[PDB]
C-alpha cells in the first residue's frame, strides 16, 4: 500500500555533567538526573514534564512548594508525570536549551524532535490547564 512515516530518533542529547541517581524518589515530583534524563524524560509512551531550577536562585526555591504540588495534584494521570532537573547541578540535552532560571520545559510524547516551553504562569494551576489542553494525552476528564 501506500503509508508509513519513517521519521526520525537517535536520542538526540549531550551533557558533560551529571548529579547522583537518587536511592528512591517516593515523591510528588520525580527526580529527573542527566545520568538517567534520556530515561525519564525522553519517553514517546508517556507525556512528562520537566522543570529546571537552581539551588542557589532565590526565585526558584520559593517555587520548589509552588511546583511540588503539582506533582502529587497530577498523580491522577497515569499519562503525565512531572518531574525536575537541576540544569547547574547538571548540563541539559538538547534541543533543551537553558540560558536564564527559572527554566520550565515539557516534553510531549513523540514530539520529541520539537518539545515545548513552559511560558506563562508559574501557578499550580496555571500549569494544570496548561497541560490540560497541551498534554496530547490528557485527564480522562478533559
Sequence with gaps: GS???SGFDGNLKRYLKSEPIPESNDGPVKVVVAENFDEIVNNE?????IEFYAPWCGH??????KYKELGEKLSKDPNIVIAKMDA???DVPSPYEVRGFPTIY???????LNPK????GRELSDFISY?????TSGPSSG
Excluded: H, I, M, W
Design 3 to 5: 503509508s508509513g512515516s
Design 45 to 49: 509512551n508517556k507525556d512528562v514534564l
Design 60 to 65: 526558584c526555591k520559593n517555587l520548589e512548594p
Design 117 to 120: 516551553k513552559y511560558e506563562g
Design 88 to 90: 547547574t547541578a547538571n
Design 131 to 135: 497541560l490540560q489542553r497541551e498534554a
Design 106 to 112: 515539557f516534553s510531549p510524547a513523540n514530539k520529541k
